[model samples]
Target: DVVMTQTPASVSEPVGGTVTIKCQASQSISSYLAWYQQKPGQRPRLLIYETSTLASGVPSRFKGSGSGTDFTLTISDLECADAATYYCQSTYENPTYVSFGGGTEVGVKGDPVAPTVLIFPPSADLVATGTVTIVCVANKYFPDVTVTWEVDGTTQTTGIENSKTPQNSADCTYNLSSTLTLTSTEYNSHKEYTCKVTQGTTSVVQSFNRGDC
Candidate 1:
């Protein structure tokens, strides 16, 4: 699968200043990349589509460059409205799947904070049915955060569902959750499960043992 890492998790710039965020992919993505910006309590809006084409109504100052693996998003003459998180995404026709950057927060103060990751045991109903659903939640994260699940160090794709919640009004941040479902026998195999959460350049990993239930 393709993987992307964005640099400079958080940055501070004055209004009218310019900022650039970098996104590097594991393999060449060529021109099949897009850029997005997300604000608190709002959905991510497309800024640059494949090949740096601005999406409809995007400002002219929001631009992208980098024809391949190393992509960059540059917002010039930054306004207060641009003080949010930016992300780069792969649109490559994959033998695997599309990938996204960790995210970069602009005009933020100090360093970016990694989100809090927690593992919740399966509910009684499911556990009693010989089926289990593990939950991983991330809180206090900036926009464009992501959750990934792994088993015994290997990434698990099947029976996984990831969702995001409304931004917390008090904190002005967001939360994300991922669920991994399995049969009791499979979990009884006692493999370790890991939840990885990332924002900007920071990441947090929380693990659950087979007997954790």
Candidate 2:
């Protein structure tokens, strides 16, 4: 398996402060780079492609550069809306793998880092009438990280909630909690759906259901 590593793992920055991500290939990847962002319950958004090209409809503040084994992802003049976890994936074949950077919590110090989606119902369909409650906790580093709720492609009725505890390990990586709830029937019935988590510069997306589980 190819190994990917990210620096800092977690970060704190001001809304307008720039954020950068570096991705290196163990072997030559021929510039097949893709960048993504996740924030709370929102879906993952593609920001950069092919190492340096911006994805369609993405904001100008986001940019990508570099080639060969070393590449850089930069966000210029960041906005509050731009705060979220960031990641880069190489489209190299064989074992056909996907990897992501841990994440960065953006904002002024003491302003709360970005939130994370920790545990949730195994990805699956949703029950027609029953409900699943997603539990999201805040990252300890950034107690202000907020969790938003969504259901079946549409956001739920509640507004985003912040958690006092952020998930972090000895490495000081920032982590937050969030979850999606669906009935067991939801697992067996509704078409595959998703729950999303976003931190500064990146997001994590999971198919409500996967073949292997």
> After aligning candidate 2 to the native by TM-score, how far in Å is the CA of 164 from where it should be?
5.9
Give the 10-residue window scoring lowest on summed lDDT in candidate 2: 164-173
TM-scores for the candidates: 0.51, 0.50
Model 2 regions lying over 4 Å from their true place: 96-98, 108-213
Taking the tens digit of each residue's C-alpha lDDT, what string does model 1 give over 69-161? 798888887665676788889989885648888999775322244688999877667777998899999877765576678888888778988
Candidate 2 per-residue C-alpha lDDT over 151-208 given as tens digits, one digit per residue, 9 for 90 to 100: 5566554433444432232223355555555556544455444555555555555444
Which portions of model 1 miss their true places by more than 4 Å?
95-97, 108-213
